[PDB]
């Protein structure tokens, strides 16, 4: 049906005969995530596997794989290519030895200056996104790897969305409840800065360890948005004010004062970052956190 279109995205032939020695690095929702060898020119890859039954929306698969095969970017993850396995997609991508974002905020406590990094690259690839017409709506530290370089990479395009100067607005309550923006929560039109937001909150993740209401449930969380606006940090006065200076312009409950992505990069919060190697440090911290 508009599954025929997906049939034609997909390249065709045997991913179980092209790839080997498959482990589990991942499982999120809708998202088994291996690792595996190229036994033709042996390179080590990343295949998110997808079951076709849990996603009733089929458009969204396909918008995946357009997304990101049509949005390279050296802060965005590497589409290789696809495969339909059954009832299953697997979607293949350049692996990257690093760890998530959340095993650094969960298990390592962050300068100032390697956050303005992290935050600096995420800017990067949102300003390449919204220039593009693309919306990611599931910025997180979950979708940030982090790679043994320091490199830092945005992943999981199964939520974003396309606009035009037609449909320059959506309007489809769409994130993770703890990162979403007050106005998708409150179900307003909504434009590109409401991952401003997220980042916004990611940022408060690296401080604090956990986005804000994280111990609420998901509905109260979402509750508590819409009724708090600008969360609160547990301990502003812990943060420099440049650093508070910049939290504010993300976390603005006006969309039309808060920045967008282009303005955030000029921010004097990420003249202090760190060199990239900074992150190093943090992710050989985390293995061995999580080992
Ligand atoms: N949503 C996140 C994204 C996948 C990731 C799986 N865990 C992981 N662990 C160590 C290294 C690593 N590198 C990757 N490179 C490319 C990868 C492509 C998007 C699948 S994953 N990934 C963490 C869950």
Redesign the pocket.
């Given at each position: 049906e508009i599954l025929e279109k997906l049939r034609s995205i997909v390249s065709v032939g045997d991913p179980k005969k092209k790839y080997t020695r498959f482990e589990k690095?991942?499982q999120?929702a809708s998202?088994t995530?291996y690792?595996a060898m190229d036994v033709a020119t042996g390179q080590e890859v990343?295949?998110?596997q997808m079951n076709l039954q849990q996603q009733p929306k089929k458009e969204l698969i396909i918008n995946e794989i357009l997304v990101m095969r049509e949005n390279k970017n050296p802060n965005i993850?590497?589409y290789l290519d696809s495969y339909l396995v059954g009832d299953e997609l697997w979607?293949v991508?350049?692996?990257?030895?690093?760890?998530?974002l959340?095993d650094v905020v969960t298990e390592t406590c962050m300068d100032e200056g390697q956050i303005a990094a992290v935050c600096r690259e995420c800017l990067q690839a949102l300003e390449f996104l919204h220039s593009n017409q693309v919306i990611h709506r599931n910025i997180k530290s979950?979708?940030?790897?982090l790679?043994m370089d320091g490199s830092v990479?945005l992943?999981?395009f199964g939520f974003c969305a396309q606009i035009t100067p037609e449909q320059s607005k959506r309007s489809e309550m769409v994130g993770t409840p703890y990162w979403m923006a007050p106005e998708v929560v409150t179900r307003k039109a909504y434009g590109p800065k409401v991952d401003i937001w997220s980042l916004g909150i990611m940022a408060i993740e690296m401080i604090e360890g956990e986005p804000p209401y994280l111990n609420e449930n998901p509905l109260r969380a979402l509750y508590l948005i819409a009724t708090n606006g600008t969360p609160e940090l547990q301990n502003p006065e812990k943060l420099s004010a440049i650093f508070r200076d910049f939290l504010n312009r993300c976390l603005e409950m006006d969309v039309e004062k808060r920045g967008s992505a282009k303005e955030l990069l000029q921010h004097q919060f990420l003249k202090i970052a760190k060199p990239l190697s900074s992150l190093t440090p943090l992710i050989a911290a985390a293995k061995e956190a999580t080992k």
């Amino acid at each position: 049906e508009i599954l025929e279109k997906l049939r034609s995205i997909v390249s065709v032939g045997d991913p179980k005969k092209k790839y080997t020695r498959f482990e589990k690095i991942g499982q999120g929702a809708s998202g088994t995530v291996y690792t595996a060898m190229d036994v033709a020119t042996g390179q080590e890859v990343a295949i998110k596997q997808m079951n076709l039954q849990q996603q009733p929306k089929k458009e969204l698969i396909i918008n995946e794989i357009l997304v990101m095969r049509e949005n390279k970017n050296p802060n965005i993850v590497n589409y290789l290519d696809s495969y339909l396995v059954g009832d299953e997609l697997w979607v293949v991508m350049e692996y990257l030895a690093g760890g998530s974002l959340t095993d650094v905020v969960t298990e390592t406590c962050m300068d100032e200056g390697q956050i303005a990094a992290v935050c600096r690259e995420c800017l990067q690839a949102l300003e390449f996104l919204h220039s593009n017409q693309v919306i990611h709506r599931n910025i997180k530290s979950d979708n940030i790897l982090l790679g043994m370089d320091g490199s830092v990479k945005l992943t999981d395009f199964g939520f974003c969305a396309q606009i035009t100067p037609e449909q320059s607005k959506r309007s489809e309550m769409v994130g993770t409840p703890y990162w979403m923006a007050p106005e998708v929560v409150t179900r307003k039109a909504y434009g590109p800065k409401v991952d401003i937001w997220s980042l916004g909150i990611m940022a408060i993740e690296m401080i604090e360890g956990e986005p804000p209401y994280l111990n609420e449930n998901p509905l109260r969380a979402l509750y508590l948005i819409a009724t708090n606006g600008t969360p609160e940090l547990q301990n502003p006065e812990k943060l420099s004010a440049i650093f508070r200076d910049f939290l504010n312009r993300c976390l603005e409950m006006d969309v039309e004062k808060r920045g967008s992505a282009k303005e955030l990069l000029q921010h004097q919060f990420l003249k202090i970052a760190k060199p990239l190697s900074s992150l190093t440090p943090l992710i050989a911290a985390a293995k061995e956190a999580t080992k």
